[PDB]
C-alpha cells in the first residue's frame, strides 16, 4: 500500500520540477489534507493544506528563478525519501525529508536550510 522506493524517487523528482518553475498549486496538490511542514526544521510547524499554501505562496509567490538538485534523491522502502537542492530568486541550500501516505501524498516534510 505505501509508495515503493521508485515511486518515492519520481514523487520527489516531481517536487523539484514544480519548485523550479514556481508551480504553487501543483506543489500544494502533492500534500495530504492534514499534512505538516517543518521548514525550516526548528521553526513553528505548519499544519494543513491552507497554511502550507501560505508557505509556498511566501516561498514562490513573488516568483522564483530556479530550483535544482545538488545530489541523489534517496528513497526508503518505508515510503520516505530525502534530497538536497539549492533555490534561486538570491540563493538558499535545502535538505528535505518527506514521508508519503499510501495515496502517494506528502504526510510530513522537514526542510533543513543553509544560507548561500
Author numbering: 0 to 88, 95 to 121
Task: Give sentences from the paper.
Based on expression yield and preliminarily estimated binding to VEGF, we chose the best‐performing design from each group for full characterization: Sam0.7 and Sima3.2. Analytical size‐exclusion chromatography revealed that Sam0.7 is monomeric, while Sima3.2 exists in monomeric, dimeric, and tetrameric forms. Sam0.7 and Sima3.2 have similar melting temperatures, 63 °C and 65 °C, respectively. Analysis of the kinetics across the injection dilution series, assuming 1:1 binding, resulted in dissociation constants (Kd ) of 190 and 14 nM for Sam0.7 and Sima3.2, respectively. We obtained crystal structures for the unbound Sam0.2 and Sam0.7 proteins. Alignment of the experimental structures to the corresponding design models showed that there is an atomic‐level agreement with overall backbone Cα root mean square deviation (RMSD) of 1.8 Å for Sam0.2 and 1.7 Å for Sam0.7. Further analysis of the per‐residue deviations revealed that regions with the highest mismatch (Cα RMSD per residue > 3 Å) correspond to the outer rim of the Sam binding site (e.g., R56–M58, A64, F95, A96, D119–V121 for Sam0.7). We ascribe this to the open and closed conformations of Sam in its bound and unbound states, respectively. While the designed coordinates of Sam were derived from its complex with VEGF (MD‐relaxed structure, Experimental section), the crystal structures represent isolated Sam monomers. As expected, the results showed that Sam0.7 competed with bevacizumab for VEGF binding.
